Amino acid sequence: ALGKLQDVVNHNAQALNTLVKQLSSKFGAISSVLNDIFSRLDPPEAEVQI
Amino acid sequence: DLICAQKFKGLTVLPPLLTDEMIAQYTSALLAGTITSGWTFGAGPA
Amino acid sequence: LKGTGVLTESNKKFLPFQQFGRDIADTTDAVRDPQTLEILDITPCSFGGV
Amino acid sequence: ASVYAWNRKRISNCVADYSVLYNLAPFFTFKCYGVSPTKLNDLCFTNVY
Numbered sequence: 504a505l506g507k508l509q510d511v512v513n514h515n516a517q518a519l520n521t522l523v524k525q526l527s528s529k530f531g532a533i534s535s536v537l538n539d540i541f542s543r544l545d546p547p548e549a550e551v552q553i
Numbered sequence: 554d555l556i557c558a559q560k561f562k563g564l565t566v567l568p569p570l571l572t573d574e575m576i577a578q579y580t581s582a583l584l585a586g587t588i589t590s591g592w593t594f595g596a597g598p599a
Numbered sequence: 600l601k602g603t604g605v606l607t608e609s610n611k612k613f614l615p616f617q618q619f620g621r622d623i624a625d626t627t628d629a630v631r632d633p634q635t636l637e638i639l640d641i642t643p644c645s646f647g648g649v
Numbered sequence: 650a651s652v653y654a655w656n657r658k659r660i661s662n663c664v665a666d667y668s669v670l671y672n673l674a675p676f677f678t679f680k681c682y683g684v685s686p687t688k689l690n691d692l693c694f695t696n697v698y
C-alpha cells in the first residue's frame with residue numbers, strides 16, 4: 504500500500520549508488536587512481552590524464 | 554556499511570528540522586480541533 | 600601503493616593467495632605487509648563539515 | 650641474435666637499479682611508453698622481460 508513513499512526513498516538511494524560507481528571509470532586515461540598517474544608519469548605528460 | 558562507504562567519498566545526509574514527534578503533535582492538534590470544533594477553528598477562534 | 604590514512608589490525612580472512620582487498624567503490628581497503636605478511640586495514644583519518 | 654630470432658630473457662626476484670645504464674656510448678634512443686625514465690626506479694613490478 505505504501506509504495507509511493509518507498510519509491511521516493513529508493514530513487515534517492517539509486518542516485519547515490521550510481522555516483523559512487525562512477526569513481527572506477529578512467530574516461531580514456533591510463534588509470535583510475537591519481538596517485539598511480541602521478542607516480543608513473545612526469546608532470547608535463549601527466550596533465551592530460553588528470 | 555554502505556553509508557560509511559558513501560561517507561568516505563564525501564557524500565552525506567542532513568537531518569530534517571522537524572522531528573517525527575513534532576509532526577505527530579501537529580497531526581494530533583489538527584485532529585483535536587476538527588473533532589471538537591468542526592470547521593470553525595480554520596476560519597478564526599474555535 | 601601511495602596513500603594517506605590510519606592503519607589498524609584487521610579481522611579480514613585473507614586466504615593465502617589473496618594480497619589486498621577492495622571496497623564497494625572499488626578502492627583499496629586492506630593491504631598486506633611484504634615483511635610480516637600481516638593484514639592491515641586502511642581508514643581515512645577524521646574529517647567533517649563546519 | 651638476429652631480429653627474426655630475437656632473444657628473450659626473464660628478469661625476476663632482484664633489485665632493479667636503472668641508474669647505472671649511461672655507461673656505454675651515448676645511446677641515440679631511450680624511449681619509454683606508459684612510464685617515465687626521469688629517475689623513476691621507485692616503482693615495483695611483477696616480472697621484467
Ligand SMILES: *[C@@H]1O[C@H](CO)[C@@H](O)[C@H](O)[C@H]1NC(C)=O
Nearest residue numbers: 631632633634635636637662
Ligand atoms: C626476508 O623477508 C622476511 C619477511 O617476509 C623477513 O622476516 C626476513 O628477515 C627477510 N630476510 C632477511 C635476510 O632479512
